[PDB]
């Protein structure tokens, strides 16, 4: 990629999240949102590396510190929506056009570290919290569908989670060094979701994951993403590990909850990114893996290889980009890569 533009938000507070809106239809402008402090800002990408301000939101709660955001749409009107959350522990659903909070969800006993929308049903929002649990909400009926935690749930803050491509299961990870699998295509979860639509509510309490392991990393796991049936996760050892539950030949949907084996297929090494809450991202087609480090360098790996050790790694740098890159986001068409930093700076890279 080639560096084409950069800007710094006037509040000068660290930015933690960034997400292009992958719901926009072909031909419509590529838009992304940034979040940090009590701010949520929307931008539109144009020619000649232009980054146009589209709308902005400033929470009345000056002490809020948004950590992440996720896009969806109101299925009743096909209108885009943006969910945001952070240290306050409240989920806010914002209308990106009027920048008004239309709904909010409280329940988590503490900060929310990550939000993810189901890849098929736009109403299903997953939140992971410092309170050790994951929560699934139906934002159409404003109901808490299920709480994932308890007897075999996480024992420390949940830092990240991700639905697989088809939205049949979730993998979570956190400060207890573990990675846990939660299937949501079970008769129980399908039924809970179904009844949540009927409400005009008793949520499901899921205490037992379908798989759990603490043998991948030796410290906090601050980011996890599905790579097909494989898993990509990182800790603070300057490496993203690619692994899978069970043995080399085990099928992800055939492994039992008591499976004790794991198979590491390789890793993507980098440097100077050992501070906590530094997230990696992939493009929609999952052909590229990206991760920024604490000194402004942006690593990009080509995933279309037979093994991670043979994946070409491109290091993107700009002599003026020296702040920690908390998160990056590819446009749906992989043509643009945006990075946000701890100094409120935003960097635009257009595809090579």
């Amino acid at each position: 990629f080639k560096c084409v533009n950069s800007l710094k938000e006037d509040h000068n507070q660290p930015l933690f999240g960034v997400q292009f809106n992958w719901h926009s239809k072909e031909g419509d402008p590529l838009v992304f949102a940034t979040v940090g402090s009590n701010r949520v800002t929307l931008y539109e990408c144009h020619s000649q590396g232009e980054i146009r301000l589209l709308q902005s939101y400033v929470d009345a709660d000056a002490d809020e510190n948004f950590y992440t955001c996720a896009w969806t749409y109101d299925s009743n009107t096909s209108h885009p929506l943006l969910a945001v959350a952070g240290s306050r522990g409240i989920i806010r659903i914002i209308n990106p056009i009027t920048m008004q909070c239309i709904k909010h969800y409280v329940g988590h006993g503490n900060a929310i570290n990550e939000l993810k929308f189901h890849p098929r049903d736009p109403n299903l929002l997953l939140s992971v919290s410092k309170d050790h649990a994951l929560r699934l909400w139906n934002i159409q009926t404003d109901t808490l569908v299920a709480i994932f935690g308890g007897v075999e749930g996480h024992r420390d803050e949940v830092l990240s989670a991700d639905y697989d491509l088809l939205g049949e299961k979730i993998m979570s990870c956190g400060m207890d060094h573990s990675l846990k699998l939660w299937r949501i295509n079970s008769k129980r979860m399908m039924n809970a979701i179904k009844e949540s639509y009927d409400y005009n509510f008793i949520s499901q309490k899921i205490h037992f994951p379908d798989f759990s392991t603490r043998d991948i990393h030796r410290n906090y796991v601050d980011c996890v993403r599905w790579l097909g049936d494989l898993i990509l996760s990182k800790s603070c050892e300057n490496a993203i590990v690619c692994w899978k539950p069970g043995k080399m030949e085990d099928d992800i949907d055939k492994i039992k909850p008591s499976e004790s084996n794991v198979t590491i297929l390789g890793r993507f090494d980098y440097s100077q990114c050992d501070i906590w809450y530094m997230r990696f991202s992939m493009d929609f087609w999952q052909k590229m893996l990206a991760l920024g480090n604490q000194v402004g360098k942006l690593y990009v790996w080509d995933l279309e290889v037979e093994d991670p050790h043979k994946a070409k790694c491109t290091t993107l740098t700009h002599h003026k980009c020296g702040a920690a890159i908390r998160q990056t986001s590819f446009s749906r068409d992989s043509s643009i890569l945006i990075a946000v930093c701890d100094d409120a700076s935003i960097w635009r890279w257009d595809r090579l």
């Binding site: 926009s24 239809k25 072909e26 929307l42 749409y73 491509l165 790579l227 037979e306 991670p308």
Partner: peptide
């Protein structure tokens, strides 16, 4: 070869997601 074979699932599943996306007409922000 496991990593390579996994790529097939990715291609098929991202295609499914892309097809559902093609059906939508979400209003632009």
């Amino acid at each position: 070869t496991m990593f390579s074979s996994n790529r097939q699932k990715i291609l098929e599943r991202t295609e499914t997601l892309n097809q559902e996306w093609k059906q939508r007409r979400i209003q632009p922000v």
